[PDB]
């Protein structure tokens, strides 16, 4: 086992921009490989033996590094190159792969579209109640969503989930589901969903009440 630290874990790049990612090893290695992995497809050999490009690879990809430090370079970034790259050592067995570097596309900031949904009548029959709040199409990825029950905040019972960067607009969509019990749900009135984002200095507030409709 040879630890291969890939830095950084995640990073963004704009089209035409230069991207450089390293991959240091705990022990000296003779050569280093590089693979490109994109969601929906299988891994792809990108560079073999440090600086040798595989078949049908654009010249913008270049390999370098020796000893305990290997780097993968992209002359000018493009949306076609948004994926996760893994480095592999080929000096000792077993053949180990690095943690991986996730490369995202940099686009213009986009405000999220918030939307809160009360629990359905089907779930309330089973003694459960889940309040969902969608935040669709925004950038960058980092975003904070907060819950409030009758004014008071709730941090336990929430389950967030982001989506991979969309290939069309290159935005991020995030979901948040607050699950509770039927009794605890029928115990309060105001259910609010707050969304604080880079493009939203103040929080975007969406709420509803049980004493309406």
């Amino acid at each position: 086992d040879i630890v291969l630290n890939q830095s950084p874990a995640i990073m963004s790049a704009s089209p035409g921009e230069k991207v450089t990612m390293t991959c240091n090893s705990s022990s000296s290695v003779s050569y280093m490989h590089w693979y490109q992995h994109k969601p929906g497809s299988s891994p792809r050999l990108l560079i073999y033996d440090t600086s040798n490009l595989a078949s049908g690879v654009p010249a913008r990809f270049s390999g370098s590094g020796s000893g305990t430090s290997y780097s993968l370079t992209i002359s000018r970034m493009e949306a076609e190159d948004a994926a996760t790259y893994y480095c592999q050592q080929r000096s000792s067995y077993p053949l180990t792969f690095g943690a991986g570097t996730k490369l995202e596309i940099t686009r213009a900031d986009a405000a999220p579209t918030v939307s809160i949904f009360p629990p359905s009548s089907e779930q309330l029959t089973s003694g459960g109640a889940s309040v969902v709040c969608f935040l669709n199409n925004f950038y960058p990825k980092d975003i904070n969503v907060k819950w409030k029950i009758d004014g008071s905040e709730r941090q336990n019972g929430v389950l967030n989930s982001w989506t991979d960067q969309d290939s069309k607009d290159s935005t991020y969509s995030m979901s948040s589901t607050l699950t509770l019990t039927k009794d605890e749900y029928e115990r309060h009135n105001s259910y609010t969903c707050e969304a604080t984002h880079k493009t939203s200095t103040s929080p975007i507030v969406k709420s509803f009440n049980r004493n309406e409709c």
Binding site: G100, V132, T163
Partner: protein
């Protein structure tokens, strides 16, 4: 043109066993080193086993050596990987890639062609059919709807809106695991003129439990 196709993945309990497969096509299968590589749920790549030209030498990492068996059938152009005493960390997407050519004058120890992989889950959790819940607003020209697919196991799960005729505005968020149960949600955005004036249906399918549910999004 080359092709690699796996098969055999599924759900097994702690200590169970499975036997995978790899369909070779578009190249002399009896001339390349074949191996298996898995991808942990945390998106980590690990080599599990490798075999040479014939059924001679084999390699197994210490984390797997002693319970996984990698055989091949050059006459049948197939690659196998027996899995026994499966622990929890064995859960992952197992690939089968091609290694170096038998006579390359010098080996590279690289895998240039991979496969789509076959998902394998090792857990003592019981297969639970999911519960589909409609998400409708409670009292903008665009309206957002969605359905909640809570409490199921194991993966995967599929969702479509109006039988796939709604591709734009759809968002299926990755499931979340909490207490041996997955929960997924999906949203769809449509013009306010189309809803609730028309019908928006949510199509959920769970191959594991072999269940399929269609749910409408009624107003209120």
């Amino acid at each position: 043109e080359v092709k690699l196709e796996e098969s055999g993945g599924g759900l097994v309990k702690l200590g169970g066993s499975l036997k995978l497969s790899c369909a070779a096509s578009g190249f002399t299968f009896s001339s390349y080193y074949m191996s298996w590589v898995r991808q942990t749920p945390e998106k980590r790549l690990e080599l599990v086993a490798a075999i040479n030209s014939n059924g001679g030498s084999t390699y197994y990492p210490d984390t797997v050596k002693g319970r996984f068996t990698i055989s091949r059938d050059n006459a049948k152009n197939t690659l196998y990987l027996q899995m026994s005493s499966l622990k929890s960390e064995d859960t992952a997407l197992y690939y089968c890639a091609r290694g170096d050519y038998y006579g390359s004058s010098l080996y590279y120890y690289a895998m240039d062609y991979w496969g789509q992989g076959t998902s394998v889950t090792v857990s003592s959790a019981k297969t639970t059919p999911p519960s589909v819940y409609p998400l409708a607003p409670g009292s903008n020209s665009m309206v957002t709807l969605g359905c909640l697919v809570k409490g199921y196991f194991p993966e995967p799960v599929t969702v479509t809106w109006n039988s796939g005729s709604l591709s734009s505005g759809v968002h299926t968020f990755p499931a979340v695991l909490q207490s041996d149960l997955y929960t997924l949600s999906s949203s769809v955005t449509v013009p306010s003129s189309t809803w609730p004036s028309e019908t928006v249906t949510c199509n959920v399918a769970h191959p594991a439990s072999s269940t399929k549910v269609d749910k409408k999004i009624v107003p209120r």
